[PDB]
């Protein structure tokens, strides 16, 4: 079989993925390697109207105290079930063309974020702003689809001080600068590198939930549960009188583990120029796993797949 | 060759007596080879949010007394489908790596409450031709639906639309508002459900028929693709945009693999049962994929029963 590589480019928001992921495709051949971009337009008019500047908008009025927890609640939810739908649909188009894990791929699948972003980490980030509810973070989690093979995601390092600079002259339409959030999807991501790496080290949250009390992966010792993803849910709206986890919250916590636990992570430096940033990237590729599709006619099918959804949604 | 499961979800538009029907099933077979996962109650009321079924009826007669917009109503109900299915997501997820292929009367059977595709779908479109939620809300969590895995035997009810209605009058949730008009909406996408498999599994192919929407199986004007010739969707010149024929895709292939059984609840709690035992006879079996995953499914389900059912 003809094999495959898919690349997750992921992370917070602010930090040069974008431009990262484009420069490394322009290397290569037309046919070869394909961008599938974020879905701006689904965010900005399809799925619903300026999406982006919602989620912002609904934050600064929970800050000000024009709107109530409940109400931001609502809005936020919504609004990140708009923001994954193109990561979704995606996702399960691409499933059944996904063979096992397998020399150059005849085709590379670069992917300005992964279905994650929308379905774990600006939610939790979210739920750590107070403008959304863990349980519904935690909806949000039991819906991630079963993680394919040769899922690579790279995620970013860059200090909070560059980032902060970053962030600040940007301007995407809708975006509030807020820096609060900045170091909440900061450290969320933090913890889902975490998160692998504990987990591929034989780590089991159920064993280590009695440490609780309040980076990088695939190199380093086994993270303390108190630094991974799971440290956030121990929240008083998720605990029984019992003071243990109601088990419906604990399963969501058991398909969390299942769904990152079989990721192939990467940390890549965006602490130098944009052409640094693509080399940097381009050597990492060297490490990462292809998979094998599963019909000689997936390839171009695949093909056409990312170029419709980049045409279609992308800027 | 590993011991067999029996999984049966049982589903429909509510008020036709689906809960009664299925308690008095659990009451014949031994009480070890049967579990009944009862409807998420708990979780609906107090673990995920606050009376989530008073919110969803009280949002709905909000907007139709022109209280709250479109919008606001969408926001609010969309919100609220998360919630109510999460209890249905989590079990269908962590019940998944224990299932095997299809496959002597099964070491375990299984009856659900509803299967997620109620929360997933039929209820986001009812809600949809109620007009407080979107399309575009509607096709993401199509996209969200779990993979179709081998024997998930759905039971569909029927019932005359009178005696539903009397039904209904008695069998109301705390914090449910009779509605005649989300009644019809929910028997129609249940029935359109039921056509849509029909559709599917006898060949039926949306992207080819697709034009007959604005020009042996059902008539695609007589499945769930007519709910998303929904201009919200399309492009100035007519055209689904592909992501959410993509998501048409998805619900295609979730929808043609199951197995719909249609359970007749015009007669007596005792029949409806007795008619509910039969009809498991067609339903298929599969294989689980570890030897101690019959008692681990034994206790997922259990569990949930003891800590969500009311
Ligand atoms: C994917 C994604 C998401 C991006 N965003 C923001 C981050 C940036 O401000 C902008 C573009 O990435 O959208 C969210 O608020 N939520 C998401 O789920
Ligand atoms: C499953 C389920 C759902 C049930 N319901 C309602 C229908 C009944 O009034 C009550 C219990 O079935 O909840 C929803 O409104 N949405 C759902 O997703």
Redesign the interface.
Known sequence: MPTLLRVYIDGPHGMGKTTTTQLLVALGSRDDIVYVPE?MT?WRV???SETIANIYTTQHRLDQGEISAGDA???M???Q??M???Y???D??L??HIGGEAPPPALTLIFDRHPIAALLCYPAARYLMGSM?P??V???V??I??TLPGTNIVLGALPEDRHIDRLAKRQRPGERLDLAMLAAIRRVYGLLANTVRYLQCGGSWREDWGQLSGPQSNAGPRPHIGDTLFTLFRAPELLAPNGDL???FA??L??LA?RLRSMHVFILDYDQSPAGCRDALLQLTSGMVQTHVTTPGSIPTICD?AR??AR??GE
């Open positions: 879905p689904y399809l799925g619903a609640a609502v809005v939810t919504s609004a079930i708009t994954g739908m193109p979704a649909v995606t399960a188009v499933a059944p509810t349980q519904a935690l909806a949000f039991a819906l689809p079963p109601y088990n419906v399963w969501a058991d398909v299942k797949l419709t959804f279609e949604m």
